């Protein structure tokens, strides 16, 4: 079995080139190739002209992609066509993969990964040293970066909103506050399914406006307050239910604790906090561990297990009431009460 | 087809996460984790201690890596062990994957990929716009980068050198010249297999000295002259056989014709020229196209088909006598004569 090593090497080589395979997709969606292929096959020449790409070089890109299953290389007349895998890339506010692909295409996203070694050495986000500014700082100043992230978070949220509204009985609640609720699709799904609920959305000012736009167009503009705020400082008191989705994993233990104590002090004895986020269990999917690493690279965050998160709550005067699933992924809804 | 669309989204999301898998490996070889595991399992704690890493973060990397098949997570006592995939990553100047993994670890390598879009719009190197300098200039000034690259090329060449010396009959030549012959392993293999042959190695000056160190160390100084120079200005004339291996694919059409015409004028009507390079045929393998894309990004190069080489040789006053298999990959030996 001398050539057992030959396969070892081949496997590791294919992993390395995987980096390039991903940048090629990033470039394909940055140029907007997949939407040009919706009305039938097109030549790489037409594709280059329409995207502002160098004709021969785009042809190399597509030939390559087709070889690894993205797009179909028709094999004549310079024609390429949509296929199962490239169709996944059609831009759509509601597509996780398509919006994330576009978000990853951004240079500063890739540059963060350039400095992965810094994260591994310090436990800190590499985004800061690679790009000369925090991820939150950048999404505050740069409307394009802000849009790429919001769209990528927005699509995941959309498919999660309806499922959370169905896993938890909000009847009995007069008021729900959504802490850092992005574009408000979770709030919007819950209000719709509970006509008597009043809601409040908390977000950074520019995102708050995005949420106002989404809620308004959902005919819920009168049922939900928008508060351009900050959840290290401001949170509404006396609400019946608080929600926080894909926020806490963005932060280190101390910061998760600072946020939790802020929520605790605003809760009524009978109030409930729903922490909605990815949990690390005993059998974490590879896919789940990668996101945990993304979180370290972009914001220095981390995915947490059942007990890691329990340890943090007990630091913040809170207790786990219930823990229920939310869509055969790693996403769980953790129902929490004041201690 | 709900279930069909889910599976497509997942397949594509894997491709995206693949960039992160590659960088995780780059970090592991940069820190030196495989070397620390040759004498049995170690804890993430000790591995961190030895490498200067942040313990909890190194643990996450290792766990992620082990989930994708690189290293074993022993599952007890915070222990990780070498395995078949991670052994491949052990620093060995004769290992293509090991040296290439280390080459790719460099931030300037990763950043060239950051700007793939530029290359795809222009057909030119993205390396220059990403790094503020050209690849050849970087490897010229900066010894670390020179060494990373020369090692990655060096290991590939060792393999190939042998395959070439045994693929071609040099028994009728008195003098051989290797143009841009790197560290000199090809010349070394050919001189070894042909005791009567004498040789000349032409390379950029700093690289030439490395060739001198290799060739002398292997007892061939007496039969190979080292010529520091530039193949755009100088090709020594009158030799029996010229060799140019993995050089032409680095250069655009104009520049390849410059090189070829100068080689043409140095040849006696009896001389042969061996162009040794990756040839694109009908239906190339993904791996061959990835390297094509690397050439694009790093130096604005491209792999070519034989017919495409033929046209260039045509504009240069040369012609193809025959092409022979070699090493059993895309590499091929194309024997040329003056026309
Ligand atoms: N100090 C702060 N105050 C308020 N919101 C913040 C904040 N820091 C980060 N955020 C918000 O936290 C959100 C994390 S993304 C999660 C968005 C939404 N909850 C969803 O599940 O889709 C971002 O939209 C960001 O705008
Ligand atoms: N202008 C120039 N003059 C001479 N050599 C050059 C050059 N530009 C690049 N090179 C050399 O071209 C080589 C291509 S790498 C291939 C090295 C060797 N032929 C092998 O197959 O292993 C590099 O070593 C680089 O130093
Ligand atoms: C708010 O913190 C998060 C940040 C900063 C991300 O970049 C990010 C996520 C986060 O939660 C994931 C959402 O998706 C889940 N958590 O399922 C996501 O990774 C899958 C998907 N939006 C893409 C990007 N990426
Ligand atoms: C000379 O031009 C080349 C440059 C500049 C490279 O970075 C590079 C190669 C080249 O040919 C390949 C060589 O080896 C082949 N051609 O198989 C290589 O990738 C396969 C393997 N040395 C690693 C790096 N990488």
Backbone angles phi, psi at B241, to 5 degrees: -140, 130
Helix, strand, or coil (residue A241):
strand
Which two tokens mark B249? 């694919």
How many degrees, rounded to 5, is the angle at CA B159 between CA B222 and CA B27?
Answer: 115
Q: Pairing mode, if any, of strands B224-228 and B198-203? A: parallel
Query: In a 3-state reduction of DSSP, which class is residue B154?
Result: helix
Q: In the block, which residue shows the tokens 């943090």?
A: A312
Cα B247 to ligand 2 centroid, rounded to whole Å: 6
Residue B217 exposed, middle or buried by CB count within 10 Å (0-12, 13-18, 19+)? exposed
Note whether A120 contacts B296, CB cutoff 8 Å.
no
Helix or strand holding residue A102 (H, E): helix A96-105
Q: Residue B101: how many CB atoms within 10 A of its CB?
A: 25
Domain with CATH 3.40.50.150 in chain A: 90-339
Sort residue B88 into left (φ over 0), alpha (ψ -120 to 50) or beta: alpha
Contact B241, B170 (CB under 8 A): yes
Q: Which helix (H) or strand (E) holds A335?
A: strand A331-338
| Helical pair A306-313 and A253-266, crossing angle rounded to 10 deg | 50
A208, A263, A211, A273: which is closest to A237 by C-alpha? A263
CB-based burial of residue A100 (10 Å sphere; 0-12 exposed, 13-18 middle, 19+ buried)?
A: buried
> How far is the alpha carbon of A73 from chain B, nearest alpha carbon, in Å?
11
Residue range(s) occupied by CATH 1.10.10.10 in chain B: 1-89
Q: Which of B30, B56, B68 sits opposite A286 (nearest CB)?
A: B68
The arrangement of strands across the sheet holding B72-73 comes to B42-43, B79-81, B72-73
Residue B304 CB partners (closer than 8 Å, separation 6+) = B248, B249, B277, B279, B280, B312
Smallest CA separation from ligand 4 atom 15, residue: B156
- The CA distance from A218 to A162, in Å, is 14
- Taking Cα atoms as reference points, which of B141, B41, B134, B149 lies closest to residue B86? B41
Backbone angles phi, psi at A36, to 5 degrees: -80, -15
Top CATH class, B90-339: alpha beta
- Which technique? X-ray
Residue matched to tokens 């800190």: A124
A254 token code pair:
């101390």
By CB atoms closer than 10 A (0-12, 13-18, 19+), residue B168 is: buried
Q: Would you call A17 helix, strand, or coil by DSSP?
A: helix
Task: State the fold for domain B1-89.
Answer: Arc Repressor Mutant, subunit A (1.10.10)
A136: Cβ–Cβ under 8 A, 6 or more apart, which residues? A299
**E-assigned strand segments in A63-182:** 72-73, 79-81, 175-179
State in Å: Cα B9 to ligand 4 middle: 32
| Resolution of the structure, angstroms | 2.3
Q: Which residues pair with A202 in a beta bridge?
A: A179, A227
Report the length, in residues, of chain B: 339
Does A73 show up as a binding residue in the annotation?
no
Q: How far does Cα A164 stand from its chain's mean position? A: 16
């Amino acid at each position: 079995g001398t050539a057992a090593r030959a396969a070892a090497e081949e496997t590791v080589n294919d992993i390395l080139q995987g980096a390039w395979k991903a940048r090629a997709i990033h470039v394909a969606v940055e140029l907007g190739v997949p939407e040009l292929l919706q009305e039938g096959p097109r030549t790489a020449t037409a594709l280059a002209e329409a995207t502002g790409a160098h004709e021969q070089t785009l042809r190399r890109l597509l030939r390559l992609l087709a070889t690894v299953g993205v797009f179909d290389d028709l094999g004549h007349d310079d024609l390429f066509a949509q296929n199962a895998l490239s169709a996944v890339l059609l831009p759509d506010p509601a597509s996780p993969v398509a919006t994330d692909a576009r978000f990853q295409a951004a240079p500063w996203h890739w540059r963060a990964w350039e400095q992965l070694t810094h994260s591994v050495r310090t436990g800190e986000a590499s985004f800061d040293v690679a790009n000369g500014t925090s991820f939150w700082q950048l999404t505050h100043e740069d409307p394009k970066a802000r849009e790429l992230f919001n769209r990528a978070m927005g699509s995941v949220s959309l498919t999660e909103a309806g499922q959370v509204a169905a896993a938890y009985d909000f009847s009995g609640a007069a008021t729900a506050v959504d802490i850092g609720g992005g574009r408000g699709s979770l709030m919007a799904a819950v209000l719709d399914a509970f006509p008597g609920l009043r809601g409040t959305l908390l977000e950074r000012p520019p995102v708050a406006e995005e949420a106002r736009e989404l809620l308004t167009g959902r005919g819920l503009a009168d049922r939900c307050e928008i508060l351009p705020g900050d959840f290290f400082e401001t949170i509404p008191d006396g609400a019946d239910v608080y929600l926080i989705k894909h926020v806490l994993h963005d932060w280190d233990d101390d910061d998760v604790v600072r946020i939790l104590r802020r929520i605790a002090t605003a809760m009524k004895p009978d109030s409930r906090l729903l922490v909605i986020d990815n949990l690390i269990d005993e059998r974490p999917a590879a896919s789940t561990l990668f996101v945990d690493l993304l979180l370290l690279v972009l914001v220095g965050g981390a995915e947490r297990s059942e007990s890691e998160f329990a340890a943090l709550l007990e630091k913040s005067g809170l207790r786990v009431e219930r823990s229920l699933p939310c869509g055969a992924g790693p996403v769980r809804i953790v129902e929490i009460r004041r201690a």
